[PDB]
Amino acid sequence: MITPLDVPPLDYFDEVFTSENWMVRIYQLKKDDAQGRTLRDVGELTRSSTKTRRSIKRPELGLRV
Amino acid sequence: AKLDAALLQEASRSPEPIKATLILASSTAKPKENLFREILQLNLNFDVDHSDSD
Amino acid sequence: YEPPATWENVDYKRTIDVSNAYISETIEITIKNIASEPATEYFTAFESGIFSKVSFFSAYFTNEATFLNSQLLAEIRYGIIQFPNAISPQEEVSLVIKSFYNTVGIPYPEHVGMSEEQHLLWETNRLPLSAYDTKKASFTLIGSSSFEEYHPPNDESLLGKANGNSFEFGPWEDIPRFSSNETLAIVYSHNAPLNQVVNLRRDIWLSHWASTIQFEEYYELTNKAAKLSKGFSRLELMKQIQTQNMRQTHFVTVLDMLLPEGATDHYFTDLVGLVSTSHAERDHFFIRPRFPIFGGWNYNFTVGWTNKLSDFLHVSSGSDEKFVASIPILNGPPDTVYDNVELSVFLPEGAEIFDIDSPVPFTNVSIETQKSYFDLNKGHVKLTFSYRNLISQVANGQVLIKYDYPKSSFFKKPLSIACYIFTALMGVFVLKTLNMNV
Amino acid sequence: RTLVLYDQSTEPLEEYSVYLKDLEQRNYKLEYLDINSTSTTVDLYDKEQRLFDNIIVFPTKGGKNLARQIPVKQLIKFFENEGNILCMSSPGAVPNTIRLFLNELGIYPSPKGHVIRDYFSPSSEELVVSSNHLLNKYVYNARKSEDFVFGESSAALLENREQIVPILNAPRTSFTESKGKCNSWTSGSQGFLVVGFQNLNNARLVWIGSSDFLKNKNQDSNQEFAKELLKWTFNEKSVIKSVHAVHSHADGTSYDEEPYKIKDKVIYSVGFSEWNGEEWLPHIADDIQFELRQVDPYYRLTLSPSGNDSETQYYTTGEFILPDRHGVFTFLTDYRKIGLSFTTDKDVKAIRHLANDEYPRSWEISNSWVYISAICGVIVAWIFFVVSFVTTSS
Ligand SMILES: *[C@@H]1O[C@H](CO)[C@@H](O[C@@H]2O[C@H](CO)[C@@H](O[C@@H]3O[C@H](CO)[C@@H](O)[C@H](O)[C@@H]3O)[C@H](O)[C@H]2NC(C)=O)[C@H](O)[C@H]1NC(C)=O
Ligand SMILES: *[C@@H]1O[C@H](CO)[C@@H](O[C@@H]2O[C@H](CO)[C@@H](O)[C@H](O)[C@H]2NC(C)=O)[C@H](O)[C@H]1NC(C)=O
Ligand SMILES: *[C@@H]1O[C@H](CO)[C@@H](O[C@@H]2O[C@H](CO)[C@@H](O)[C@H](O)[C@H]2NC(C)=O)[C@H](O)[C@H]1NC(C)=O
Numbered sequence: 040m041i042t043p044l045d046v047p048p049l050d051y052f053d054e055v056f057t058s059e060n061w062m063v064r065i066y067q068l069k070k071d072d073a074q075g076r077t078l079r080d081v082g083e084l085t086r087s088s089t090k091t092r093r094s095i096k097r098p099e100l101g102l103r104v
Numbered sequence: 105a106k107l108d109a110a111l112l113q114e115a116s117r118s119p120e121p122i123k124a125t126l127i128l129a130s131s132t133a134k135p136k137e138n139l140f141r142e143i144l145q146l147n148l149n150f151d152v153d154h155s156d157s158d
Numbered sequence: 159y160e161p162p163a164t165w166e167n168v169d170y171k172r173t174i175d176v177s178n179a180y181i182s183e184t185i186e187i188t189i190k191n192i193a194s195e196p197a198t199e200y201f202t203a204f205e206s207g208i209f210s211k212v213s214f215f216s217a218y219f220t221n222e223a224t225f226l227n228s229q230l231l232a233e234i235r236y237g238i239i240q241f242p243n244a245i246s247p248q249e250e251v252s253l254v255i256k257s258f259y260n261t262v263g264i265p266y267p268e269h270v271g272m273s274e275e276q277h278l279l280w281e282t283n284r285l286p287l288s289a290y291d292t293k294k295a296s297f298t299l300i301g302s303s304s305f306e307e308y309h310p311p312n313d314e315s316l317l318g319k320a321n322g323n324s325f326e327f328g329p330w331e332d333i334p335r336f337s338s339n340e341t342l343a344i345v346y347s348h349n350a351p352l353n354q355v356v357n358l359r360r361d362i363w364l365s366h367w368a369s370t371i372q373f374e375e376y377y378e379l380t381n382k383a384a385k386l387s388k389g390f391s392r393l394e395l396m397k398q399i400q401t402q403n404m405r406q407t408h409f410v411t412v413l414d415m416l417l418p419e420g421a422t423d424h425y426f427t428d429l430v431g432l433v434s435t436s437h438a439e440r441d442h443f444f445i446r447p448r449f450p451i452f453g454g455w456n457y458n459f460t461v462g463w464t465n466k467l468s469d470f471l472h473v474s475s476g477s478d479e480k481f482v483a484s485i486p487i488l489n490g491p492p493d494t495v496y497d498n499v500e501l502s503v504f505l506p507e508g509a510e511i512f513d514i515d516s517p518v519p520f521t522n523v524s525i526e527t528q529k530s531y532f533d534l535n536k537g538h539v540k541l542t543f544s545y546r547n548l549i550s551q552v553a554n555g556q557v558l559i560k561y562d563y564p565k566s567s568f569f570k571k572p573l574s575i576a577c578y579i580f581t582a583l584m585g586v587f588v589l590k591t592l593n594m595n596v
Numbered sequence: 597r598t599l600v601l602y603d604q605s606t607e608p609l610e611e612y613s614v615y616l617k618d619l620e621q622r623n624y625k626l627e628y629l630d631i632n633s634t635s636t637t638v639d640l641y642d643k644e645q646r647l648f649d650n651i652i653v654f655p656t657k658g659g660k661n662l663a664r665q666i667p668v669k670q671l672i673k674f675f676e677n678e679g680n681i682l683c684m685s686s687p688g689a690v691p692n693t694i695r696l697f698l699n700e701l702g703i704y705p706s707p708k709g710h711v712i713r714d715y716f717s718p719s720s721e722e723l724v725v726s727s728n729h730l731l732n733k734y735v736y737n738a739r740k741s742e743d744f745v746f747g748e749s750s751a752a753l754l755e756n757r758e759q760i761v762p763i764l765n766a767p768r769t770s771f772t773e774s775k776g777k778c779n780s781w782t783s784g785s786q787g788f789l790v791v792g793f794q795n796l797n798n799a800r801l802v803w804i805g806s807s808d809f810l811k812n813k814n815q816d817s818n819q820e821f822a823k824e825l826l827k828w829t830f831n832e833k834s835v836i837k838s839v840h841a842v843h844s845h846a847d848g849t850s851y852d853e854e855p856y857k858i859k860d861k862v863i864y865s866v867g868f869s870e871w872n873g874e875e876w877l878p879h880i881a882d883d884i885q886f887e888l889r890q891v892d893p894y895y896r897l898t899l900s901p902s903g904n905d906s907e908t909q910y911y912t913t914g915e916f917i918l919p920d921r922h923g924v925f926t927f928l929t930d931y932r933k934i935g936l937s938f939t940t941d942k943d944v945k946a947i948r949h950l951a952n953d954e955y956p957r958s959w960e961i962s963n964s965w966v967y968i969s970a971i972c973g974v975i976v977a978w979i980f981f982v983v984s985f986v987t988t989s990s
């Protein structure tokens with residue numbers, strides 16, 4: 040028996056078909072984001088974060104080539 | 105060894121000395137004595153890898 | 159070709175109905191002639207984009223209707239109406255134009271959830287493109303429940319006054335001539351499924367030895383409704399079935415095929431195999447596709463059935479061996495629009511077609527041959543019609559073929575198969591009287 | 597068309613009126629909107645189509661009014677639909693919406709307290725950056741050395757993404773300081789004063805980090821750079837169309853008449869075109885590379901011009917031999933040069949083995965003459981064996 044707190048969400052694929060008795064699931068590779076950011080950051084952008092709370096910090100990104 | 109992973113590829117591909125420049129300028133000090141002088145030239149003779157950061 | 163003169167519109171109604179996934183207009187005109195040579199013709203003006211997609215064009219008199227000779231020609235393009243009993247040059251006449259179109263509009267939110275209402279965007283004229291001067295002209299937009307304009311004009315006139323399930327307005331006096339001054343765009347709720355097929359080929363097979371006619375139809379249907387956002391999820395569909403009652407919504411779950419009266423051997427196949435979810439009750443052939451056809455999806459399938467020939471074929475009176483067949487031009491679901499129809503009737507192998515009549519003006523016709531089972535000679539006579547733009551509800555017609563089929567060519571089928579069996583067995587005789595013994 | 601967000605009591609619109617009227621000299625139908633004077637939310641979409649081609653955001657503070665007008669997600673959705681954005685910041689006024697929206701694009705402006713400081717007295721009353729620090733062409737290329745005023749400014753730390761197009765650099769001896777005892781935001785030459793960003797849908801953004809730059813009191817130093825910077829920001833200065841990307845056999849026949857084959861002679865031809873705002877001119881360029889490609893690339897060939905037209909300069913690759921590896925190869929030109937428009941042309945084709953007929957023939961090859969002569973000898977000696985065997989008497 041599984042629970043909805045299991046099955047982590049899917050941020051690179053999206054379903055396009057699923058049969059009547061849920062046998063054959065058909066998924067699609069959704070296209071990479073236009074602004075170049077990774078799709079799990081789009082997924083964590085569009086939900087669950089972060090209760091209208093912020094933080095301002097030196098982003099520790101290294102250096103631009 | 106704990107530098108970036110972007111300058112060592114560029115200094116390893118093109119043979120050129122990386123330079124070190126010291127700055128001790130200020131606000132209450134008037135100009136034409138502020139230190140903008142490159143003081144050191146290093147060297148490198150290492151081996152790099154693939155998948156650059158290109 | 160512009161018409162000169164001699165008609166002036168006193169009254170001019172224009173009622174657009176938008177309620178069944180094809181636009182229908184019922185114009186009602188009352189015309190007055192001018193003092194000149196009495197002319198007997200009329201010109202109805204259509205745009206170049208609407209004239210390409212039009213499927214029915216008819217005219218009545220308003221006193222008591224008989225019919226009129228309504229001819230559609232072949233950049234504003236016209237359609238002529240011919241009157242009997244040539245009219246005196248100063249007398250009022252009354253007139254009714256009906257017309258049925260192909261386009262229905264664009265889904266104005268093109269992405270919408272499956273449990274949500276859709277709204278469509280239709281574009282048309284507000285001032286009527288008449289080839290003549292009008293003195294009074296009222297518009298009436300009948301149809302579904304909610305009508306709303308799109309980019310409403312600043313003028314308080316030429317603005318829609320909403321009535322109970324209606325939308326009434328119009329430029330009401332003194333419109334001089336061809337008026338493309340303003341183009342209307344109206345959004346409206348529309349809960350029909352919007353079934354439309356792209357290519358229908360239907361093959362029928364007359365058979366004198368079996369005395370049966372055999373229908374086979376290949377539908378390539380799309381759903382031109384609004385596409386669904388966030389993709390498709392079986393969970394929301396199945397919960398949407400389990401909640402209540404399946405009201406009127408977009409997608410296609412069942413199709414009701416209205417067949418001729420006594421139909422015997424029903425089948426419903428896809429490309430990949432047959433489908434077992436079909437129910438052939440008396441006079442009605444219900445169909446469930448494999449996947450529910452949402453907005454923008456394709457589905458190509460094949461249905462077929464078998465009628466007796468005694469009620470579609472009739473022996474003529476002058477000669478016994480001359481037959482006249484009247485074929486139903488179109489059987490399908492009640493709410494469909496057909497973008498292409500090719501009706502192939504197949505007469506038997508020795509038939510020769512004399513006369514051909516069709517009630518609907520076709521795009522093309524040709525006579526070929528095609529070899530089916532045990533067509534040892536040239537084969538069946540494929541008389542194929544090509545109709546372009548048809549409506550399921552409107553095009554009630556029968557195609558009338560007059561041919562002959564003499565008994566000299568009726569018995570040539572078992573005699574031809576007898577000719578192959580006979581020459582095969584004499585071939586066996588030559589290969590057994592022949593000496594090869596070294 | 598264009599849009600202007602601004603506010604009073606921080607930076608009025610009058611001291612920008614030299615540039616917007618310049619946009620009035622073009623065919624840009626401007627449409628202003630004022631914070632602290634308008635309470636209605638911008639209908640940036642009616643249902644699903646986009647009203648404005650552009651947007652220009654003059655400096656402000658983003659307490660509640662800016663999030664009322666444009667939030668971050670609405671601005672992402674505007675920028676993915678070819679919506680060009682020009683946005684400004686300053687240490688006197690850092691909006692929060694624009695700071696988070698730029699953090700989604702890998703551009704990290706300095707916050708409220710941090711200001712950039714350059715010593716050595718360039719002007720000693722305000723910071724000013726010479727034209728040596730312009731990193732990229734195709735946005736502005738200085739014909740001679742000039743200065744660009746920047747009254748009080750803030751630099752940006754940049755992520756190493758492909759899409760980010762740097763335009764101007766901090767003058768390599770600068771830093772940031774705050775009233776609070778926080779760390780320094782950027783180093784000398786790693787901060788960027790103005791930053792461009794080009795979408796994958798070829799939409800463009802310019803963050804430009806000074807309120808004292810675009811003002812009406814500065815045309816003596818930064819007049820042409822701001823006019824051609826605003827030529828670059830809206831897609832008017834450097835975009836590229838790729839018209840005909842066709843490949844065929846070397847003798848003129850197409851793939852349709854004869855499909856390809858291993859070890860075959862083909863030709864490939866693509867033509868580019870740029871747009872200076874008025875005319876499609878032919879695009880002179882090096883660096884364009886064809887790739888014949890499976891999972892791994894089998895050919896990278898630079899393209900020689902060999903052609904011309906009124907609004908297109910073509911490029912060929914020369915007759916090159918297909919690989920003896922069979923498979924389904926794609927023909928690819930990714931012209932991806934930062935500063936100007938990205939273009940991709942690909943065509944996936946099947947390239948098959950040799951047929952059984954299309955082999956070197958046995959009489960053609962010099963080695964098989966022995967065996968043709970011996971098979972012909974056995975056959976002729978067999979015919980004299982059967983005639984001699986029948987016609988003899990035993
Ligand atoms: C089932 O029937 C439908 C309806 O006729 C078929 O759809 C049609 O398929 C053809 C070829 O796949 C489409 O032609 C294509 O046109 C586009 C431009 O419109 C072009 O880019 C393609 O290269 C190709 O020429 C046609 O548009 C399409 N019709 C509709 C209304 O979508 C479908 O192929 C049939 N499927 C099967 C399995 O038989
Ligand atoms: C009308 O129907 C005829 C059928 O006889 C069509 O003519 C054929 O067109 C096909 C093209 O798909 C050719 O391959 C055949 O050779 C043609 N046959 C003959 C006898 O001409 C014709 O194209 C149709 N015309 C229109 C306007 O639909
Ligand atoms: C910007 O907003 C402030 C805050 O409301 C405005 O200040 C008000 O101005 C009106 C008259 O213009 C006064 O009646 C109020 O008492 C002021 N309120 C405060 C808190 O000062 C200011 O006018 C606005 N700026 C503009 C240009 O309209």
Ligand SMILES: *[C@@H]1O[C@H](CO)[C@@H](O)[C@H](O)[C@H]1NC(C)=O
Pocket residue numbers: 877878904905906909
């Ligand atoms: C050759 O290309 C140049 C590119 O600027 C163009 O101006 C010129 O008209 C072209 N000439 C011909 C003959 O196509």
